[PDB]
Design an enzyme around this catalytic site. Sequence first.
Site, PDB file in Angstrom:
ATOM      1  CD  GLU A 248      -3.152   0.775   2.084  1.00 31.20           C
ATOM      2  OE1 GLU A 248      -2.805   1.025   3.440  1.00 31.20           O
ATOM      3  OE2 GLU A 248      -4.431   0.478   1.926  1.00 31.20           O
ATOM      4  CB  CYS A 279     -10.049  11.784   2.759  1.00 32.53           C
ATOM      5  SG  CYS A 279      -8.925  11.736   3.892  1.00 32.53           S
TER       6      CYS A 279
END
EC number: 1.2.1.3
Lengths: 447, 452
Positions: A248, A279
Amino acid sequence: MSFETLNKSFINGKWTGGESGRTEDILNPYDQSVITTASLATGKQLEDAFDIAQKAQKEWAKSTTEDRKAVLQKARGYLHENRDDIIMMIARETGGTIIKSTIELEQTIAILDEAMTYTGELGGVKEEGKTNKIYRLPLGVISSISPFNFPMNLSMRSIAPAIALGNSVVHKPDIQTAISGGTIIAKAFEHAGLPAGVLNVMLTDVKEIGDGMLTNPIPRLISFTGSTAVGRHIGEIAGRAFKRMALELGGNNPFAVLSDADVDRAVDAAIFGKFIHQCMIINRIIVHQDVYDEFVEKFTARVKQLPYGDQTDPKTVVGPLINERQIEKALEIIEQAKTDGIELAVEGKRVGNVLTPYVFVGADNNSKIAQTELFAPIATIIKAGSDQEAIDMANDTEYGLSSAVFTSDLEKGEKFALQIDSGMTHVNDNPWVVEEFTVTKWISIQK
Amino acid sequence: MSFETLNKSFINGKWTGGESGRTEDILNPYDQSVITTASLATGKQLEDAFDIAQKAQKEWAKSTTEDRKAVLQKARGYLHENRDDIIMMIARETGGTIIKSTIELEQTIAILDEAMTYTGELGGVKEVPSDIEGKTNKIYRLPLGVISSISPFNFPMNLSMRSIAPAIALGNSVVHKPDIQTAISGGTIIAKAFEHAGLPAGVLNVMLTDVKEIGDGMLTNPIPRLISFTGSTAVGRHIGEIAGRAFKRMALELGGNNPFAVLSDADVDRAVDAAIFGKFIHQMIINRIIVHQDVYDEFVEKFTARVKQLPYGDQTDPKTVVGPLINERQIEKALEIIEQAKTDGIELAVEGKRVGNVLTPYVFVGADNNSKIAQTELFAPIATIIKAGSDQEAIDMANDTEYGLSSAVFTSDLEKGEKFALQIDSGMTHVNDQNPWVVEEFTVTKWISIQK
């Protein structure tokens, strides 16, 4: 509520001193005071840990749904019942505000809950004299690395499902966020009676271990979160050993504001996404020419009213950066954008170890500052000639993890999100995990 | 039917000569006779091809299910109508037997049949609406983009199509590179099939070239989003590093030490038979054969006697079982390995020999599982039989390999076979023998949140 005590590696269900003779003082990044001193584990201690994890896993692969659901629930309980002190510690060590820190704890807890949800996922799917048994099995040992930003959150993202699915874990947090990034979580699992060796948290550094976490033949997965340049390094080591990777990476995430945007709401989302929630991670704000001047003006004025300083003060929005080196990184980027002529709508300062917000405007989507993964309270506003061009400017990057598009027309937001080459997009801003942490095994049986 | 006419790359819908100046004769392995001569494409040509594949993919993404099923149908249709000539050509180029070749053409067709079942997969699922009101989370199944596909000299057509057909089914484009020595069966015939099927220019590109022209060109180009490769481990590691660094997906298949375990309760006769088909007729490569003690001597005698009969020679003959090895470097490699085991002490129950470029089966018996001949990938008609003192050791011995892709276990007890199968680090185990995972490989998951 005395987490500062938790300054040691956790290996084999036991708190272990580092036998390297070295120490790291872990600092509150706002005032540079020592929170605690940690001795660093060795290249040998890491090796022993992976061995221990290999052993413990063969047993953990045979535990019931009950036990596992149970260990996770007690671990989640520990975190929840201690939420006040943990949020405080997270803020102290991390430099994230009380707002950001709370979101991180809660996110952490949600992960645990979610993971309880797939604990029972280790059975078989029973699918022309032949029959085909598909089985979901534990992967093995997992090598887990987390960074200094959102360290608890991102650690548990690997540690929870791993454990939920009959795996074992050797976990290494950034030392400067070891407590939030590893030692609190280790305490919760010990508390919950996790068998020795299923979770190992390593307090150490590079000088001590080199690529030890990546190079060891034992682990069958490297889970990582951090920059893409470290990603590239991990990706090259893992690919070469044929290890599975759960990467990630921070990305260069475009926030696009279209011709028909409700602007106040866009400003809100941009401010909240960029600073408060810190977000996705927002770097480039691409705005359509017809609402450009307005969006710039309001964003600019809302940015200048953001309080900065001590993260442990509830009123604070912009806290200090983690260390010197990151401050220099942001400053070099800012110097470079200045010599490039890019206008500074909001010029900040270095105050102690806080970098106050900068806002660059009228930038080229291709500019050095626009094309940089930063992690600083630095925003880059970019004018787009049309909605189509906004979408393409969004695509013009090599790092796309996330994106955001603001528009009154939800149908057209969706058609545009589909054109953004990225895994996630938010218009106006669950099953695949199990697969990463398990082996589907196939057995064909004949008559 | 003059498949030797197809000695060119197929780029952007055209048969395109190589611009490098260099050429290579594609040979029949048995006699070294020239099937055709192919001009080698260049680094620059490959980059054009990737560039061209990227363009075509944006448009191919817009194709309907029917567009895509039709293309595959006519493609599978071309191969079946033409099965006889294709089988012959696979045999000639490849040195594989008419039997082996028929199986390969059949499997290639099976793969195309399978693709049609999931061409439908490119559409959006809703779920998990978030705690937030007015929030919708939608997941879409989209194409990956441009696939880089590389195939080797053994089973060229089957393995190539194992990447070509899902790629195209799921709206991707493809730049494909067979081993030049098997470019007709590993590339050009496939290109001809898809052309016949009205596949748009640029969606399938087949490169006739060599590494001497292209270096890491299939690997380094920033364009493709998946590298598909079958070949040696060392090249695998080289791909893994390059693709890992660039975060491309990778479907690697690497040699390749597949154990055949024959447990105490097994039906020996079934097991000898299944070991012959796998090791000699079908060639899933059975490298070493592990056989429990109480049934060992029975298995050897039967397996040895049966191997000794097998027809060897011209592979274009429909009753030949053992044809030539792919080239001369393979023979020297095989023979040097055989010398290794000889000096090492290992018994040779059945001694083969070299007739032209054919080597006749060799069977080594009573080998250590930790032996050179046991641990080595070969792809030669060499079998190695290993003694096990228990069924657990048998399964232990099967595990103890560099890597395991596939395994086979033979037991009378079907519960016992399944539980031992579960004890082998290998993707696939068959008991007494010898797709949604693919859709995920060739597609991306796109997630969109909308807010009211």
